[PDB]
């Protein structure tokens, strides 16, 4: 405890550069997991369409996908509009 | 008599250490120099233009 | 008296101003008044060719509105 | 108003040196445009300010 | 050539001191270049009596280097008493 | 007339030289220290166009300022030979004008001219930082009065 705190204090005095790099470098590894927006970040990347949403043939029994790009059914992203 | 010139041991208090750490990280004495020259930029130049005016004897 | 410094940077201020002024106006002049088109991707480049083909005068910066079609 | 004071002070410089032509003469030939007081003029034509 | 007060603060603030109290450029505070005629003093020997050179010379009072031993118990003696270690300053100790 | 255009090109060339001559960083002795006072803010040599560039490959006027001695005379002439054309050498101070105080000693060359073609001579021991300030400007008048192309068009 006392040795550890003194070693930090001796570091912070002898060198302020690597401790600052080690500190902010250390954080850059941990909070990405704890962040509650990282699952949102992948959703944003998934939302952005670079290729065409190629249509698929109808054979019945397909309620999920819409028949028109205005129908209420289908994947909607009003979460991202407010976000 | 004589006066010692430079052996001033810096304090190791957390305030002093952070002050030195801020000084090293956020360059301050370098900025102190820049502010110095800028102040010494808006002065009046000591030059005199030649023969139209001449130095004092 | 520090004012004498200003004439030096004054002409310099104009000197760096000419390039950005030139490029913007040259682009505005050559490209039919409109700002020069940017083609960072094939879709933009493909779009530019279609404009040139439908222009008839072989010039991308000649946009024909609804009066072209029936 | 010190800005406009030094502005009008420079204006008294150009008027003091016999108008614009005299101002350009001393700027191009004497390199300094400050006005002074004629304390004397020698026989050879050198004005002493 | 008097600086505008606006930049008087700028030069003062940027250097953290009052320049206008004492400037490097000189001004009317200098001593006048024309001064009244001075009357210089006389020396101590400018006496019109009892100023004989025999009791005033300095050159003719130097003897030849005194000789103390020539190649032609006693206590140990240093050339001079050892110096006394200088005391620390009073007006300004350790910087 | 071709004389007119030659004279106009004459004035153009020398004016560039006299307003941009660069005194070398060549100091010797007592005569050099006050020459710094010329470069000091009091007189500000740089305001007259000159810059104190080292490296005789990039200098015009050589300020021989101080006592010129035997052991260095080869070094100076090597330095002078390295200077490109045009090159001028202002003998500055009485030591470099003939030997100065030590004219009669055993290891001083009596005069900088015996090694180098010496231009305008500025006297003084030392010449005041202003005394050769005229010396530099008086050389600028010498540069002004040259003919060069005028001789070439009449050669
Ligand atoms: C940055 C520039 C901002 C705009 C101009 C204001 C400015 O720089 O004022 C300088 C002016 C002059 O310097 P100073 O040391 O205060 O003057 C002391 C004596 O009064 C000085 O006494 P003086 O007798 O020397 O005053 C006469 C002087 C007065 O000179 C001026 O007032 C300079 C402005 C042009 C006239 O004019 C001359 O000497 C004539 C020669 C002028 C040379 C060319 C000037 C070019 C200006 C820029 C052109 C466009 C680029 O300083 C101020 O007025 C301080 C305010 C600065 C405001 C900055 C706002 C941003
Ligand atoms: C030993 O002894 C010594 C002395 O004494 C003998 C001295 O005195 C002194 C004291 C004197 C001093 C000045 C003190 C400093 C001197 C030193 C030697 C100390 C060491 C110096 C340094 C560490 C710093 C050195 C700094 C330098 C050299 C400054 C450099 C920067 C500058 C801005 C200055 C130079 C500027 C120049 C040359 C002008 C621009 C250059 C051009 C080429 C001109 C422009 C050209 C063109 C545009 C090209 C043409 C094209 C055109 C016109 C375009 C149109 C045409 C087309 C075809 C396109 C010292 C110290 C000394 O030790
Ligand atoms: C941009 C610059 C535009 C103007 C350039 C003008 C030409 C300058 C060239 C360099 C100086 C030489 C010159 O002017 O003519 C060469 C002429 C060439 O003929 P010259 O005979 O006079 O050359 C000098 C003498 N000798 C040959 C012995 C070296 O030289 C001179 O004018 C210098 C005198
Ligand atoms: S001329 Fe005089 S000042 Fe110059 S180097 Fe010789 S002795 Fe020194």
PDB file of C-alpha atoms in Angstrom, chain C residues 2-47:
ATOM      1  CA  UNK C   2       5.471  47.509 -34.512  1.00  0.00           C
ATOM      2  CA  UNK C   3       3.141  48.686 -37.300  1.00  0.00           C
ATOM      3  CA  UNK C   4       5.976  48.327 -39.821  1.00  0.00           C
ATOM      4  CA  UNK C   5       5.653  44.551 -39.453  1.00  0.00           C
ATOM      5  CA  UNK C   6       2.150  44.637 -40.940  1.00  0.00           C
ATOM      6  CA  UNK C   7       3.049  45.716 -44.538  1.00  0.00           C
ATOM      7  CA  UNK C   8       5.194  42.601 -44.778  1.00  0.00           C
ATOM      8  CA  UNK C   9       2.437  40.173 -43.810  1.00  0.00           C
ATOM      9  CA  UNK C  10      -0.138  42.356 -45.581  1.00  0.00           C
ATOM     10  CA  UNK C  11       1.085  41.508 -49.079  1.00  0.00           C
ATOM     11  CA  UNK C  12       1.695  37.968 -47.839  1.00  0.00           C
ATOM     12  CA  UNK C  13      -1.934  37.824 -46.694  1.00  0.00           C
ATOM     13  CA  UNK C  14      -2.949  38.610 -50.266  1.00  0.00           C
ATOM     14  CA  UNK C  15      -0.310  36.189 -51.563  1.00  0.00           C
ATOM     15  CA  UNK C  16      -1.816  33.116 -49.906  1.00  0.00           C
ATOM     16  CA  UNK C  17      -5.272  34.471 -50.740  1.00  0.00           C
ATOM     17  CA  UNK C  18      -4.800  34.275 -54.522  1.00  0.00           C
ATOM     18  CA  UNK C  19      -4.576  30.431 -54.820  1.00  0.00           C
ATOM     19  CA  UNK C  20      -7.766  29.672 -52.915  1.00  0.00           C
ATOM     20  CA  UNK C  21      -9.415  32.565 -54.727  1.00  0.00           C
ATOM     21  CA  UNK C  22      -8.141  31.314 -58.083  1.00  0.00           C
ATOM     22  CA  UNK C  23      -9.113  27.650 -57.715  1.00  0.00           C
ATOM     23  CA  UNK C  24     -12.607  28.453 -56.446  1.00  0.00           C
ATOM     24  CA  UNK C  25     -13.317  30.895 -59.273  1.00  0.00           C
ATOM     25  CA  UNK C  26     -11.670  28.764 -61.968  1.00  0.00           C
ATOM     26  CA  UNK C  27     -13.786  25.806 -60.857  1.00  0.00           C
ATOM     27  CA  UNK C  28     -16.828  28.086 -60.803  1.00  0.00           C
ATOM     28  CA  UNK C  29     -16.053  29.388 -64.293  1.00  0.00           C
ATOM     29  CA  UNK C  30     -15.176  26.155 -66.101  1.00  0.00           C
ATOM     30  CA  UNK C  31     -17.945  24.070 -64.514  1.00  0.00           C
ATOM     31  CA  UNK C  32     -20.896  26.156 -65.695  1.00  0.00           C
ATOM     32  CA  UNK C  33     -21.191  28.382 -62.634  1.00  0.00           C
ATOM     33  CA  UNK C  34     -21.852  25.420 -60.354  1.00  0.00           C
ATOM     34  CA  UNK C  35     -19.169  24.236 -57.952  1.00  0.00           C
ATOM     35  CA  UNK C  36     -16.865  21.565 -59.365  1.00  0.00           C
ATOM     36  CA  UNK C  37     -18.234  18.056 -58.931  1.00  0.00           C
ATOM     37  CA  UNK C  38     -16.450  15.668 -56.568  1.00  0.00           C
ATOM     38  CA  UNK C  39     -15.932  12.027 -57.575  1.00  0.00           C
ATOM     39  CA  UNK C  40     -14.509  10.124 -54.605  1.00  0.00           C
ATOM     40  CA  UNK C  41     -16.280   6.884 -55.560  1.00  0.00           C
ATOM     41  CA  UNK C  42     -17.310   5.009 -58.684  1.00  0.00           C
ATOM     42  CA  UNK C  43     -20.961   5.915 -58.101  1.00  0.00           C
ATOM     43  CA  UNK C  44     -20.129   9.612 -58.428  1.00  0.00           C
ATOM     44  CA  UNK C  45     -17.990   8.937 -61.500  1.00  0.00           C
ATOM     45  CA  UNK C  46     -20.732   6.790 -63.032  1.00  0.00           C
ATOM     46  CA  UNK C  47     -23.189   9.585 -62.252  1.00  0.00           C
TER      47      UNK C  47
END
